[PDB]
Design a protein around this ligand. Structure first.
Ligand SMILES: CCN(CC)CCC[C@@H](C)Nc1ccnc2cc(Cl)ccc12
Ligand SMILES: CCN(CC)CCC[C@@H](C)Nc1ccnc2cc(Cl)ccc12
Ligand SMILES: CCN(CC)CCC[C@@H](C)Nc1ccnc2cc(Cl)ccc12
Ligand SMILES: CCN(CC)CCC[C@@H](C)Nc1ccnc2cc(Cl)ccc12
Lengths: 305, 305, 305, 305
């Protein structure tokens, strides 16, 4: 069947929601892969029954063998151990193992990396898998901006999706939030600030909140996995359905912002041909300085893998 | 049942698509009303069967009696005769007749006016129906900008919805297209122009195309009714589901842009409380001059009704 | 792009709704083809703008040249002149012309025939196009049963889709309604009759209503095209998304019900491989007698083409 | 806002998926309530961001105070300790506490009970909350039959939703699977058995699999919560949107099947008025004997609470 085959390399919390959302949207057949014995089979069985409730027809199966990567159209990697820097070499080993199988079983698959630090892990897998630069991206901006877009929408009382924002450079503490590129209903946010509808102080607090959301969720005795999963599926769906959505993801930089041979967060266009366009925001020197900071941290960690 | 009741006052071409789209989205019960005998019943019967194909449960009935306006949550007016100025007094008579029944049968319904010239006809109905200012709007910007957003998206090869634009003042020849407020993926269009991805000349042609689309469709031996219907439903749905989307519609101006006691196109926020916010774009003197032109034409025609 | 290409051979009323529904569901690129100059271009332009309102990315274009059949994944034929028997030879000529181009431009496309009498016209196109038997079907049962399912659901006050029914043999006056195969929520209808929830007399009236619905809609000064379009799209979507839905359509009979070398309405399974299964209902002699009647009328008209 | 308010009393695994699915479907505002400090707030924050990805506008908040039950339109109870019979009195205490607050804060809310044993726990809450019989149901048949419908659909290679089946009496080991009431595309399953498309032996194995699915998932080192959540949402959605779907749920029996003053699984119709119809299947003596067995076990456990 010409039905897309989506292999989720890692059957943890994010993997579970991704599987659920795929069936809900009837995106394609799903394989929940992991090295943990049977668990992926158990989650796959549970999820497979939702086909009835959702009027879908997507096979959902578990797997403990890399062989099931064969025929994969899309591969989503969430696998990985969770100082923080001590995991770098370890997770690189996981990227190496996965990359070798991708190269052997599905060299033409579209890859989405989630493993943290994503900006580092994505380039590592790109290198070990050998896939073209336009066929591999990392999760970052879609998730990070969903927080900023959401918090602003609540203050302004408008549909969350009506707020657009851009966070670039890298996923994580060094993420670059661009106040200048925020709009509401397509209108520059500054107009709403001029109107006293939202203050600069309110925005600064929202910015800090955005950068520290994962930490905030963790401190509330939970962990972020639902939004990450939803952000990942928006990306995968844009590719599978050739939507050509403009989404901020970690992609290989070839001179943009003055950086090369490194992956960084920036808006790109995802369609049937993968990363069809890499958009370079015309940042000013101040924003560029922050982007530089993001890249520096990515390079720092890359060197330790 | 707490199911919304949507009464379509006018069962023509736009009315038919609206009915179809309502069932597709299971938005609520539909009444296709018109003075033409039986036709609304015939279209209603045809459309009612689609409930099976769409897994919906919306009653779709025809009507030839104004009494069916009772219990209406949303009323959509497309009725109206189609120089052009000679129809003004005639269509005003239709607005008067409809307004009297709305006032009597559903004073708390949310009204959307389509009848042209919409900016004139909407204020007339507002006056004859007596509903609050936040409960009546006219179709305009959503439809007009859908053209501009779509044409630009094709030139740039991105998802149509990713292009945001603003057309204000009035629906029609005097519509004000604001080049300065166009974005792609939330990014100012000017950046794409600086990049040679789209030229100023290309945009000028797209602008003219946008203003003359209805005429273009008519010259191709067709008439626009599908997009208008879809634009209307996006508006009605934002209200019914309390989405709080920022949509450009004709609303009563109370000083915005320097105009009062007149309806004009401008972004507003539609939610459970109707027009929850009227957004005033901070236009420069040049854009304001064009808006003035739009209002002037509306006043001109209003005076002839 | 791996986006499906759907060519609508005939840009009339049914064609328009199909185009609209395809964009709503983001099913694939659409081509509105017809011999009428420009009209398809005009309808295509109007419909194309709805991509913004629906968050879709489907190209919608018009066409006046058969060449655009190239690359077609799905072809839907509604073209055709509308005694009634005098049109048979004329419409056969249309089927011949279309069939020659399908054979030349898209021999592997999946074909859905709507032209009436569908059961006759579908076999004619099958013959002239040369496509495999599993790649061509005619619209019939999905539309006819949607009426029966809907009317029964209203009497019983249950979701329309919860009522399942089977109408076979042929589309049209000789359609075979099988009372014995009607269920509500999967429960045999007879149980509801035993319960006095619906009477046999009520059902008989609903049956007559079902058979005469087109005529009823026509007498109300309208024409059925919305449900037909929706029924057609349910079929096309099952194929495109490999849903494997059980849908009653006109398919080539190879001995089922005692008939061969003729097309007739019967439940089939539509998936990525087209007609993946032809299901033969185990009818009793009485039901079989009626089916025979349906086939006889189809053969009668086939002989006059 | 006239937006429905859904309070999830219990913020565990099933609660999380329910919250996620509600936003995906934009069903209404969600409150994740639990006695565990902050966790519901953490899950609520994570889930709230998905509003952007799903184009929804549903508030998702956590809560540690029963007061938030005020204004609730729908209340879903999953809270509860997890011999097995020793938990009965304990879980009854939870039902009592919740029931008192429902009675005080939202007496007109529609209640769905999940806590096991559901058939027992649902009647207990019905008693402690005092809500009308038509406003409270327990999860059972929708989940159980989704397994049976799914397994059969895979053997027959048809859309999962096209297989309809009925499991009644009680949720759990004593569930009554009715082979006689299974259909495929509305066609009696027996016809497919006569055709050798599926054997009686295959079905017997599927039956055992259906009854032991939770156990099977648990043995694979997982736990069922995704399907349960999806089944619950289908029920809640039928009520909220007045779909009037026929769904098998635990409801108060008033003489049906010969049982009274007890809750049992049976098809019902859920609409704006809650349980609008309780459907009694015309079971034979053999099926009735099994149903009796189910009720007996429910009564046994009820007596120990
Ligand atoms: C002792 C166990 N070892 C080595 C035999 C297993 C392999 C270890 C490294 C390479 N890979 C992994 C380690 C841990 N988890 C993983 C999850 C997925 Cl999905 C894929 C690979 C993983
Ligand atoms: C001769 C016929 N006349 C007067 C009796 C009918 C009423 C005329 C004016 C007021 N109204 C109308 C005229 C024409 N079309 C309409 C469509 C709708 Cl939906 C509602 C009112 C309409
Ligand atoms: C005089 C005009 N003639 C002959 C040149 C045109 C061709 C006539 C027959 C074969 N075909 C047709 C006749 C009428 N309508 C049609 C609509 C479609 Cl979409 C496709 C073919 C059509
Ligand atoms: C020692 C802690 N006790 C008593 C103070 C808390 C209350 C205990 C019983 C009645 N209720 C409960 C016990 C355990 N979990 C629950 C989860 C939810 Cl959502 C609601 C009520 C719960």
């Amino acid at each position: 069947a010409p039905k897309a085959k989506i292999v989720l390399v890692g059957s943890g919390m994010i993997g579970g929601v991704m599987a659920t959302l795929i069936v809900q949207k009837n995106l394609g057949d799903v394989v929940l892969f992991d090295i943990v014995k049977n668990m992926p089979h158990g989650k796959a069985l549970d999820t497979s029954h939702t086909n009835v409730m959702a009027y879908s027809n997507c096979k959902v199966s578990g797997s403990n063998t890399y062989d099931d990567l064969a025929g994969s159209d899309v591969v989503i990697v969430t696998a990985g151990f969770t100082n923080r820097l001590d995991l770098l070499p370890l997770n690189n080993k996981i990227m190496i193992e996965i990359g070798g199988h991708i190269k052997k079983n599905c060299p033409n698959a579209f890859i989405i990396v989630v493993t943290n630090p994503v900006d580092v892990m994505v380039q590592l897998l790109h290198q070990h898998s050998g896939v073209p630069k336009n066929k591999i991206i990392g999760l970052g901006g879609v998730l990070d901006t969903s927080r900023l877009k959401y918090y602003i929408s609540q203050k302004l009382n408008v549909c969350p999706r009506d707020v657009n924002a851009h966070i670039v450079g890298a996923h994580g503490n060094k993420m670059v939030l661009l106040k200048r590129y925020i709009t509401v209903g397509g209108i520059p946010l500054q107009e709403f600030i001029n109107n006293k509808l939202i203050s600069d102080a309110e925005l600064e607090a929202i910015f800090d909140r955005t950068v520290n959301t994962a930490l905030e969720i963790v401190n509330l005795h939970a962990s972020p996995y639902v939004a990450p999963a939803a952000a990942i599926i928006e990306m995968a769906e844009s590719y599978l359905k050739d939507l050509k959505k403009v989404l901020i993801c970690s992609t290989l930089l070839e001179g943009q912002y003055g950086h090369s041979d490194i992956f960084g967060g920036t808006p790109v266009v995802l369609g049937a041909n993968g990363v069809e366009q890499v958009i370079e925001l015309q940042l000013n020197s101040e924003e560029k300085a922050k982007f530089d900071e993001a890249i520096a941290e990515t390079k720092r960690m890359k060197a330790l893998a």
